[PDB]
Design an enzyme around this catalytic site. Structure first.
Site, mmCIF file in Angstrom:
data_model
loop_
_atom_site.group_PDB
_atom_site.id
_atom_site.type_symbol
_atom_site.label_atom_id
_atom_site.label_comp_id
_atom_site.label_asym_id
_atom_site.label_seq_id
_atom_site.Cartn_x
_atom_site.Cartn_y
_atom_site.Cartn_z
ATOM 1 N N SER A 51 1.067 -1.003 -0.200
ATOM 2 C CA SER A 51 -0.195 -0.215 0.128
ATOM 3 C C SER A 51 0.960 1.661 0.028
ATOM 4 O O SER A 51 0.019 2.228 -0.210
ATOM 5 C CB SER A 51 -0.627 0.462 1.188
ATOM 6 O OG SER A 51 -1.746 -0.755 1.816
ATOM 7 N N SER A 86 -2.355 4.045 2.952
ATOM 8 C CA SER A 86 -3.147 5.140 1.701
ATOM 9 C C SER A 86 -3.190 6.462 2.246
ATOM 10 O O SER A 86 -3.148 7.153 1.328
ATOM 11 C CB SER A 86 -4.540 3.928 1.591
ATOM 12 O OG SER A 86 -3.714 2.242 1.880
ATOM 13 N N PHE A 145 -12.267 7.565 15.678
ATOM 14 C CA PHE A 145 -13.127 6.621 16.421
ATOM 15 C C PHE A 145 -12.553 5.279 17.184
ATOM 16 O O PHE A 145 -13.654 4.845 16.896
ATOM 17 C CB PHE A 145 -14.162 6.490 14.703
ATOM 18 C CG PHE A 145 -14.731 8.115 14.597
ATOM 19 C CD1 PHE A 145 -14.632 8.319 12.783
ATOM 20 C CD2 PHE A 145 -16.038 8.423 14.918
ATOM 21 C CE1 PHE A 145 -15.257 9.741 12.589
ATOM 22 C CE2 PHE A 145 -16.086 9.520 14.789
ATOM 23 C CZ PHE A 145 -15.798 10.322 13.796
ATOM 24 N N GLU A 146 -11.370 5.523 16.429
ATOM 25 C CA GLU A 146 -11.203 3.132 17.203
ATOM 26 C C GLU A 146 -9.626 4.000 17.277
ATOM 27 O O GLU A 146 -9.310 4.938 17.029
ATOM 28 C CB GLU A 146 -11.424 2.333 17.045
ATOM 29 C CG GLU A 146 -12.399 2.009 15.939
ATOM 30 C CD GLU A 146 -13.210 1.658 17.552
ATOM 31 O OE1 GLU A 146 -12.849 0.311 18.109
ATOM 32 O OE2 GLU A 146 -14.445 1.463 17.702
ATOM 33 N N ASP A 183 -20.293 4.858 16.308
ATOM 34 C CA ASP A 183 -19.365 4.466 15.294
ATOM 35 C C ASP A 183 -19.897 5.275 13.588
ATOM 36 O O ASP A 183 -20.662 4.295 13.538
ATOM 37 C CB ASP A 183 -18.304 3.173 14.612
ATOM 38 C CG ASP A 183 -17.526 3.544 16.045
ATOM 39 O OD1 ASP A 183 -15.896 3.098 15.561
ATOM 40 O OD2 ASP A 183 -17.961 3.073 16.896
ATOM 41 N N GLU A 207 -11.120 5.952 1.643
ATOM 42 C CA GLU A 207 -11.485 4.333 1.523
ATOM 43 C C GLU A 207 -11.599 3.882 2.203
ATOM 44 O O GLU A 207 -12.488 3.959 3.042
ATOM 45 C CB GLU A 207 -9.643 4.341 1.723
ATOM 46 C CG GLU A 207 -8.975 3.526 1.802
ATOM 47 C CD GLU A 207 -7.463 2.771 2.336
ATOM 48 O OE1 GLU A 207 -7.214 3.637 3.511
ATOM 49 O OE2 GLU A 207 -6.985 2.081 2.261
ATOM 50 N N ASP A 227 -9.509 -4.795 2.119
ATOM 51 C CA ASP A 227 -7.702 -5.095 2.020
ATOM 52 C C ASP A 227 -7.620 -6.595 3.428
ATOM 53 O O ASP A 227 -7.286 -7.472 3.222
ATOM 54 C CB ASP A 227 -6.485 -4.634 2.771
ATOM 55 C CG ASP A 227 -5.265 -5.117 1.985
ATOM 56 O OD1 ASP A 227 -5.001 -4.991 3.427
ATOM 57 O OD2 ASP A 227 -5.150 -5.444 0.683
ATOM 58 N N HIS A 279 -6.557 -10.585 3.625
ATOM 59 C CA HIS A 279 -5.904 -11.115 4.337
ATOM 60 C C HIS A 279 -6.179 -11.700 5.819
ATOM 61 O O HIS A 279 -5.496 -13.645 5.555
ATOM 62 C CB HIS A 279 -4.674 -9.923 4.977
ATOM 63 C CG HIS A 279 -4.273 -9.204 4.199
ATOM 64 N ND1 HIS A 279 -3.066 -9.825 3.704
ATOM 65 C CD2 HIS A 279 -4.060 -7.856 3.992
ATOM 66 C CE1 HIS A 279 -2.517 -8.869 2.831
ATOM 67 N NE2 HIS A 279 -2.984 -8.057 3.646
ATOM 68 N N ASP A 313 -5.318 -0.137 -5.079
ATOM 69 C CA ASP A 313 -4.275 0.094 -4.833
ATOM 70 C C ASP A 313 -3.296 -1.393 -5.672
ATOM 71 O O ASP A 313 -2.583 -0.779 -6.086
ATOM 72 C CB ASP A 313 -3.913 0.543 -3.622
ATOM 73 C CG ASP A 313 -4.126 -0.653 -2.271
ATOM 74 O OD1 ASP A 313 -5.477 -0.916 -2.705
ATOM 75 O OD2 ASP A 313 -3.897 -1.083 -1.730
#
Ligand code: NAG
Ligand code: NAG
Ligand code: MG
Ligand code: MG
Ligand code: MG
Ligand code: MG
Ligand code: ZN
Ligand code: ZN
Ligand code: ZN
Ligand code: ZN
EC number: 3.1.3.1
Lengths: 479, 479
Positions: A92, A155, A269-270, A285, A311, A316, A320, A357
């Site tokens: 990224s 990103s 937010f987190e 949230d 984004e 992504d 994973h 990306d």
């Protein structure tokens, strides 16, 4: 299932006639773009797009593949080549340098030419390359960064940061020799490199000193402040601005966005990345779509226009984990945000690009029937006499052997949100893939996005279209 | 390896500036297409295109990803949706109906609407849909079919045939009840349905009666004639035409193509499908590029223009075997044929489209360094402590267990032409994949190929561009 309407050729001949007339109606822009929006689906390759289209159509009451995604209605499409300078399957950070700065880089570095070297602080200076968001800011536009990951993640960081190591989120991650040499952690660069009007996403923890309790999880010490230098970067950001507000939950974000007098907004937010949409607490949230509307309410006030990065960052992550349910639901919310932004902006003065990306080793196979669930089993048994899913991975953490053989899978298992699709090679995390990704464009100068292009084209057409970057002397009429 | 030229931003800024100027130079056609060419890479999805680009660049003395394929220079690109009416991951027959006839169909049927049903001869009549090659012939154009598979295989058959069962190559494959009901085998339909000026590819065996020795393999009885009706379809084809020639080897093909007086040419180079390019006998068999030049030498004589189908047909086969070396080398020859056709035709009067009928569950992963071989091992070991390749499959015949575990792989093994990349699920043949494929276009009306479109668009834009099919009343100026 075979839908009866589609058995008649005229269904298909009328559709194609409509398609032709629509194609004949498009004409290119002679005018500049006032606003620029780049929608970045992290890891959203072509296979992701088609599986997400099918899921989204089935969530509506449809069969699936025939129903267009919001990104599918963009008139102009191109293929984008992702390789980084040093590696054929990219990360990224270095892709971010290509699509946000217009220069290719070395894997795991951000905002640097390929003369820099990963994790070598002493190879940074003289290799910084400037983003088109920095240039839109220098031209007087308002600028915003919206994401579901940490705002210091790779990103978003490509819009403002310059670093040889994407893992340096806070000073606690930076080796002492690099701190001494001046390589600033990404959270510091977020408040220091340039003025950003709207900052929304995760990453609260890197902004505060070790010991500071998180506001949302005060009874979980691992979610607290990480800094070693005793700084409170939110307060340092807030202090240089009149009308700046910091928010950490949904209710304050939305109220702040409705208040003229606000003008600068940091919403974290987190502690780290935001929750996947299926785990989101809707009282605390904001969804990706709500963050993007909130950002647009503020950014749109500037008469000179804006630059906005949006984004869909955990697409992504879902891949994973080899949990396609997570990757596809994050892709649908990302498309929902694209649709929303389209309702709040005009294609007459806004150049909007949707891209990824890079991709993942994610595949949609077997020979499932029309209307069947995307998380289902493929028709028929495999050569080892056990069932298999239509969705699979080349590699990743879904590889499993039970008593020396591939495990069988049931439909109830394969449709679970925690299910990991099988893979051919066990890895803790499934890998990115190096195949070309799509580019979708609409708005002034969008017709310049065409063919097969290097990933740096994304950055360069945005600057050209708004007459920024090395392109004033654009030959464009005002927006 | 990091190429020193790419460490300087200006390398990338100059490239993108050139890209922008080229993009600004393109303008749409106000004129019709005299000629139509459809290049069909069977199974050539986006992952195939990028892996083939890398291999082809390395065959030149380059690093790989930066070197454009011939198909990559086409100005206009679109995404194409492949689903068949009844199945989300399609087959060649029903995709052929969409991109050659402009109507979607049911899996494993060819040239029929979706009111027909697979293997049900009594559901054929009234459901035939006509190809754009049939219509170009009705308008007086010359027409040609070139492929590396049998000429009765599914994709070429979509240009001329109408059948509920793609497996009916000769009458020996057709059940007695279907023969009685009149469902003609594909080899019969090839000579009977319409006049085809040039027919080149494999499939000699289905043209002759049981007992007829093959000319090239007279000492192998399994390569001989298959027909049950005692017919010699080559002679029946030859008999209705003045100046028709039949050829079975390279030397006679090339001589025939240089002879005015020929006018009609049937070239059948192998009993079944042609050999993969890496196994080709260059004294006896023409490459895909040579077949396409041979076809163009004849087709180009007609003043009214031509329609030409050119198939890179064994790209697909390589993927089914899970032998990416075979799939990628067939893709490079397919791109070589596209380049050649481009040298022998003008983009001022020829609409050329490159596409795939569908994709495969083929992925390009791991994190290999710039310039590394595409058939190499990914850097680092997998979680089971053994090596793994950058190229993998979701499913297919490369799945293997040796004493209850995934086998290790060496670089010498992984670069062999017989090597099967590993997969997550054992299948005798790897499966197609359902993700969108690319469409590449150049020539008159090519700018109508854009965005995200149903696969029937391919057929419809070709007919519109040449003012055929349901589109005379096109509003186009002469070519
Ligand atoms: C950076 O420091 C390392 C370790 O001392 C050294 O090997 C390298 O040469 C230095 N590089 C520069 C750019 O000065
Ligand atoms: C075709 O024949 C089969 C077998 O006799 C029969 O079941 C089916 O109804 C027939 N269909 C038509 C189209 O007549
Ligand atoms: Mg990201
Ligand atoms: Mg929260
Ligand atoms: Mg084929
Ligand atoms: Mg031969
Ligand atoms: Zn990514
Ligand atoms: Zn990733
Ligand atoms: Zn196929
Ligand atoms: Zn196939």
């Amino acid at each position: 299932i075979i839908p009866v309407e589609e058995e008649n050729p005229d269904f298909w001949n009328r559709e194609a006639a409509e398609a032709l007339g629509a194609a004949k109606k498009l004409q290119p822009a002679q005018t500049a773009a006032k606003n620029l929006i780049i929608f970045l689906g992290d890891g959203m390759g072509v296979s992701t797009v088609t599986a997400a289209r099918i899921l989204k159509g089935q969530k509506k009451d449809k069969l699936g593949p025939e129903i267009p995604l919001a990104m599918d209605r963009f008139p102009y499409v191109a293929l984008s080549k992702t390789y980084n300078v040093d590696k054929h399957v990219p990360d990224s950070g270095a892709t971010a340098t290509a699509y946000l700065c217009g220069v290719k880089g070395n894997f795991q570095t951000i905002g640097l030419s390929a003369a820099a070297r990963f994790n070598q602080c002493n190879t940074t200076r003289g290799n910084e390359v400037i983003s088109v968001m920095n240039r839109a800011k220098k031209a007087g536009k308002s600028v915003g960064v919206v994401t579901t990951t940490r705002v210091q993640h790779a990103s978003p960081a490509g819009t403002y940061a310059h670093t040889v190591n994407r893992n340096w989120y806070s000073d606690a991650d930076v080796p002492a020799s690099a701190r001494q040499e001046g390589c600033q952690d990404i959270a510091t660069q977020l408040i220091s490199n340039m003025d950003i009007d709207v900052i929304l996403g995760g990453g609260r923890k890197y902004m505060f000193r070790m010991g500071t309790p998180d506001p949302e999880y005060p009874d979980d010490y691992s979610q607290g402040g990480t800094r070693l230098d005793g700084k409170n970067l939110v307060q340092e950001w807030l202090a240089k601005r009149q009308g700046a507000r910091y928010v950490w939950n949904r209710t304050e974000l939305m109220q702040a966005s409705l208040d003229p007098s606000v003008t600068h907004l940091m919403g974290l937010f987190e502690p780290g990345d935001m929750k996947y949409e299926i785990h989101r607490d809707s009282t605390l949230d904001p969804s990706l779509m709500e963050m993007t509307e909130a950002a647009l309410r503020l950014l749109s006030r500037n008469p000179r226009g804006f630059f906005l990065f949006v984004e869909g960052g955990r697409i992504d992550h879902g891949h994973h984990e080899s949990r396609a349910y997570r990757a596809l639901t994050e892709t649908i919310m990302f498309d929902d945000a694209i649709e929303r932004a389209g309702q709040l902006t005009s294609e007459e003065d806004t150049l909007s690009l949707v891209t990824a990306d890079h991709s993942h080793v994610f595949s949609f196979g077997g020979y499932p029937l029309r209307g069947s669930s995307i998380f289902g089993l493929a028709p028929g048994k495999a050569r080892d006499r056990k069932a298999y899913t239509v969705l699979l991975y080349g590699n990743g953490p879904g590889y499993v052997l039970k008593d020396g053989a591939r495990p069988d899978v049931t439909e109830s298992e394969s449709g679970s949100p925690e299910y990991r699709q099988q893979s051919a090679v066990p890895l803790d995390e499934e890998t990115h893939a190096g195949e070309d990704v799509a580019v979708f464009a609409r708005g002034p100068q969008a017709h310049l996005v065409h063919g097969v292009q290097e990933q740096t084209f994304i950055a360069h057409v945005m600057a050209f279209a708004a007459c920024l970057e090395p392109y004033t002397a654009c030959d464009l009429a005002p927006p």
